[PDB]
Design a protein around this ligand. Structure first.
Ligand SMILES: *[C@@H]1O[C@H](CO)[C@@H](O)[C@H](O)[C@H]1NC(C)=O
Ligand SMILES: *[C@@H]1O[C@H](CO)[C@@H](O)[C@H](O)[C@H]1NC(C)=O
Ligand SMILES: *[C@@H]1O[C@H](CO)[C@@H](O)[C@H](O)[C@H]1NC(C)=O
Ligand SMILES: *[C@@H]1O[C@H](CO)[C@@H](O)[C@H](O)[C@H]1NC(C)=O
Ligand SMILES: *[C@@H]1O[C@H](CO)[C@@H](O)[C@H](O)[C@H]1NC(C)=O
Ligand SMILES: *[C@@H]1O[C@H](CO)[C@@H](O)[C@H](O)[C@H]1NC(C)=O
Ligand SMILES: *[C@@H]1O[C@H](CO)[C@@H](O)[C@H](O)[C@H]1NC(C)=O
Ligand SMILES: *[C@@H]1O[C@H](CO)[C@@H](O)[C@H](O)[C@H]1NC(C)=O
Ligand SMILES: *[C@@H]1O[C@H](CO)[C@@H](O)[C@H](O)[C@H]1NC(C)=O
Ligand SMILES: *[C@@H]1O[C@H](CO)[C@@H](O)[C@H](O)[C@H]1NC(C)=O
Ligand SMILES: [Cl-]
Ligand SMILES: [Cl-]
Ligand SMILES: [Cl-]
Ligand SMILES: [Cl-]
Lengths: 372, 371, 371, 372
């Protein structure tokens, strides 16, 4: 028996890209592991259709989503952008095939699509986990530095802190033109802002650290908190002995033996090298959709046509399994809110930079709050 | 001769909707007025295709845009919500037909689409006017109250003020599960927050005023600023004798006699007012019509979204539209040539006195405030 | 006509070494430039013998010096390390051929050799400039960090300050078994030692800066002084925006246009810089050439170290060299007539600003500091 | 059987010197005793070649070292200066005949000669023995007065005291021009510096005492520590009753009967009168090299030529015996560090001036520290 899934990935070169990125590789990686796994889909071969497209091309994303639907798939692991994903989301809702999302995207409440889940930990919860950390460090003031216009929406639960708890916090945006953040850092330095929360990509975080050291802000006077769940992927050796306090989060359950086995195996496969959060969530996504097909009553992949009208009769029940799903993945205990389909409940590691290196100094969940 | 514009509008019932909404009306209304203007497209006839769809339905929007492109249009006037226009923009760009946009949309920098303009005043500029106004009242501390998450992304040049200036700024959000903003208001009142900025629709604004009064907050101790451009359209009679300071903006150039004439024609087809959406759509349709007249000869073509052919004269037309300069209902209209966004524009500043709401100044990105 | 200078240089592989080092290059480079200067030894041709030897090998040095004297030279340019030149100096003095020295050497008072000069600025004078600078920053307490034992003998006029002035001075040494100065740095940081003087090579200095930053000590709370004359040659871009105060000295007269011209020719044969060793060797070779031209007629002779004959014109030449006065790459050059040492010279004082490293003064044994 | 050793000694008059100095006499003295000793080299006559040269003449030192090497010797007891000795050291390393050193000399680490030992107690250890004394006297401050530029290098372990233990110490240099140290003593007196450590020759120490008494600093308010191991050779009778505290060291094991027998016999030989440290170390050196030749397997003295290339085949093994050597000499328990060849482990007497005269009030070694 053969079952098929669809993946759409964004590449700087679109369809012409010749070298495979980590998302797509993680995809192919997890499909292969499930096919060598004797306990999961033992008699079914999990195959895929992979489509490569330019960044920020909704139209192209629509064209490929329809192609895959015509080819027949049980789910579409939609594109990684926020604009491209809100087009495939609508299509998956019309044709009733599950859409799987890996990165935070804005879900307007007044938007009534239900045919999706989202594996990235919800930013409302993340904002709370940051607040519990900050209240625990006793900070009475702090600055929030975010990258793109979207940070304010992601951090709204955090920005509305002054009106609840007693912490005055300033708010600054990294330059849109340049990725030279020195002029900003000069302003924070002059402003004696010593406790800072940086919301931004692991890439941009590496830059900010390098440049904070150039500005003489990598000392015992400073405490940085990073929102990136890929903190453990930064080379922090050049900053290890400076004496800065540096704290962030980790959702990847490294303390678990079979997870470490998978991350090691993953890096052995890489040719460009750790497993970042993007790949780990996709590996978990492909597993949840597989595990769910197995517990779902027998269904078939149907060729659906976007211009046509027919929907997928099995979709509704399948989507329900996925939502109700609860599975232990690389990124720990996985579960979605049943109505929103968002991953608003999860477990975080609180990690902190020591001389000896990054160290797990606690944990957090929405129910138990902080625990150091 | 005949030119055809495509229009896509969003409804709660989708296509099934029975009644036109204000926007679709302002669309039909403005196409009709140019066909009667003998000084504008005199011997050419503007026509339109009109599609109705459900809110937040990009898939539907996609299909209707493609239907229209296959029909032959020189421009498409996209939906309102910010989710659908991402899809239609992308299409208009692949086939190179101008996409006219009327409401604020997030335009990521990474995004390389060029076949659009957007007639809504850029919120980065509105944010700057709001700062100029706050600092002009000499406010040292305020409270920013907003509605949908997207309000943040908009007022950002304002939220980042407590480090570009001496001002302390609390932040709150209207209830998402209700229209009952009373509980919030109790907390602002306890908080002794007297100077407040409300980002929200004119509808919400009317609800907020009525509830603010009920809460004992409509007095001379309070000063509210509204960012809604539709402020002048609210019934403020229940409030003008309370002592409250109430201030905001207006982009509809009502001072102009010819605008006032038009605002009257329209409101006689709708107290004798024309909202921003309607007036911006009216200005969009004119701008496109006038840029067609002005440009060289060109032909409309049927285009397939599955085929791979772009509109020949597309690029030529799109530049006429980006470079356009036009005195519309909403004042002088001009676009940033690079971004296609309306970052330069004029605002009238209005305020609530006993004699009623009145213009107590002006603003522009160049001159800032003038009173 | 032909004059011949002898050069002895030290290498890790000794004679076997394949690649020239900077010094031997600056030697060949400077002999070549005078042979092209028609205003200097116009109709006479400067040539050289060059010997390579192992570091710290006086026996080898002895043999090569003797080889060269038997070949016929008007001067010998001794090795770098301080162990070997004691031997070659003694030889040059017995046979009375000038020994040119380029690096600091201990010159015991009991020692009665007179056939040498030494172009390195005397460290007793450098020590005085370092005091003038410290007392000018109004430092009340510092920490002197040095590399090799010999650093002490050099900074002595500075170490003896806490009884010739009100200043309290801790003393530390870089690890001898490692280049990892981090552990030391931890102890200075705990010690709250913020004002620090580093005596060490430019290489070591670069290591120290990089490790100081890693240790969280490159900030506005710290002020480092470097005694290395090669400071202006370090890449300080990673550090100029941190706020650190960084100060030191420069004897290369880079302000002078003609020096800058030359520094450029050389670095195009090596970011476009010329270290002190290279520039001092260049000045030595000129000084000797110019003192030959200026002196009376004289002949080179083959001399045996086992025989007992001294160079006839030796003493006459040696006095021309000791009494020499010359504007070289390293500024005005002049020697103490008695000691043959360079105790009088000019220093530019440089400091690290955002705009980069720059000259914020000058110094000389006569006028002391001037800012 | 005849075996031969080489000695080079520095004389103010060089080769023309007619009156023999104490070093050279000690040399000739020990050779004679070994030749009358029935238990040490019973069947071998120890002969020598002695060369006299000017002070600070490396070239001359090289010429004589080569002459002796051509003549064939089993060791060369190199010249007493620091500049002259670092030339013979190199030669002995090339030709592989042991070089024997009697006085502290700078051994740059980056210098890779191995064909030498040095009998003077290492100054790093001496600095430690001084520190243990000072910490034991409870001094919280003190001045260090040294003579020639070299003192700082010899005393580095002591000068870096402030950053380890808690003792603030000033640092002053005796005048290079003059041996009139009164102007300096005036400055220390005015500066109320009462606890002083003088690093300098026994000759210069005698001068400083005489002049400290003239300056009225020879009282119960003052405590002087002298580094010179020749302290016992100073006439301290004029200062004995002043009440000053005056402490120094002694490596010459006087408490040993056969040592006193040798020192008495030595003074009986002198015509210019105690045995100073210079002569005693040379007597010990000549003995260690003899004792080592006897335990070494049979070897021969070879005529080596400096211009030639050949080295001495027996040298390496001989040098090894010498380094590994451990012998009780006039200067107590003798042993070298096997890699450095320096005498960094030894035993000191702590002596102090009383009314009744100089008295042994304790002992010190690097392992046991101080013991009073
Ligand atoms: C097989 O799949 C099961 C169920 O998810 C998982 O627990 C197990 O680790 C997998 N085995 C291997 C070795 O892949
Ligand atoms: C850094 O952490 C330490 C100890 O964990 C804390 O005492 C200190 O306040 C922190 N630094 C800042 C600037 O908060
Ligand atoms: C799940 O999300 C929904 C939709 O926002 C929310 O109303 C509900 O409170 C959540 N369920 C629970 C019990 O957390
Ligand atoms: C209302 O406006 C008046 C002046 O126009 C000002 O004096 C007063 O302070 C304002 N009210 C508040 C609470 O700011
Ligand atoms: C148009 O807008 C962009 C983006 O905000 C801005 O950077 C640029 O200055 C504007 N272009 C011109 C030439 O005015
Ligand atoms: C750095 O230099 C400035 C003035 O140039 C001085 O005020 C400051 O104290 C210096 N830093 C230290 C730690 O001495
Ligand atoms: C040369 O140097 C010596 C030694 O430092 C010094 O004493 C003397 O004053 C100098 N000679 C002259 C005449 O300048
Ligand atoms: C003979 O030499 C031995 C061994 O060093 C020594 O112990 C003894 O004192 C010597 N005897 C005499 C009287 O010289
Ligand atoms: C001299 O020694 C005595 C007793 O041994 C001691 O009490 C006194 O403090 C010493 N003098 C000085 C100046 O240290
Ligand atoms: C002997 O000296 C060597 C060379 O400096 C040193 O490394 C070693 O620690 C010493 N040996 C011992 C065990 O004292
Ligand atoms: Cl199966
Ligand atoms: Cl109303
Ligand atoms: Cl460098
Ligand atoms: Cl025998």
């Amino acid at each position: 028996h053969v079952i098929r899934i669809g993946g759409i990935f964004e590449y700087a070169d679109g369809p012409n890209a010749q070298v495979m990125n980590a998302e797509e590789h993680a995809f192919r990686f997890s499909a292969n592991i499930i096919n060598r796994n004797r306990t999961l889909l033992p008699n079914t071969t999990l195959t895929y259709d992979i489509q490569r497209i330019h960044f920020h091309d909704s139209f192209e994303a629509t064209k490929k989503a329809c192609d895959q639907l015509a080819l027949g798939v049980v789910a579409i692991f939609g594109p990684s952008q926020g604009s491209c994903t809100n087009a495939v989301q609508s299509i998956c809702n019309a044709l009733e095939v599950p859409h799987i999302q890996l990165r935070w995207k804005h879900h307007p409440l007044d938007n009534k699509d239900t045919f999706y889940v989202n594996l990235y930990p919800d930013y409302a919860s993340l904002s709370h986990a940051i607040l519990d950390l900050v209240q625990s460090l006793k900070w009475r003031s702090a600055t929030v530095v975010y990258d793109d216009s979207t940070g304010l929406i992601r951090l709204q639960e955090l920005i509305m802190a002054p009106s609840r708890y007693n912490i005055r916090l300033k708010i600054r945006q990294l330059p849109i033109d340049s990725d030279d953040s020195r002029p900003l850092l000069k302003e924070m330095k002059r402003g004696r802002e010593f406790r800072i929360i940086f919301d931004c990509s692991h890439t941009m975080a590496a830059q900010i650290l390098k440049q904070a050291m150039a500005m003489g802000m990598m000392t015992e006077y400073y405490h940085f908190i990073f929102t990136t769940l890929d903190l453990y992927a930064l080379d922090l050796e050049p900053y290890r002995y400076s004496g800065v306090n540096l704290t962030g989060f980790r959702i990847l359950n490294v303390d678990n033996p079979h997870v470490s086995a998978i991350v090691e195996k993953w890096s052995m496969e890489r040719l460009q090298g750790v497993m970042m959060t993007d790949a780990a969530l996709l590996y978990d996504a492909v597993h949840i959709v597989s595990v769910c097909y197995q517990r779902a009553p027998q269904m078939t992949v149907n060729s659906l046509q976007c211009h046509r009208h027919k929907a997928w009769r099995f979709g509704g029940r399948f989507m329900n399994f996925i939502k109700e799903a609860q599975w232990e993945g690389l990124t720990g205990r996985i579960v979605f809110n049943k109505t929103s389909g968002l991953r608003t409940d999860f477990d975080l590691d609180i990690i902190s930079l020591k001389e000896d290196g990054l160290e797990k100094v606690g944990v957090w969940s929405p129910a138990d709050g902080l625990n150091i």
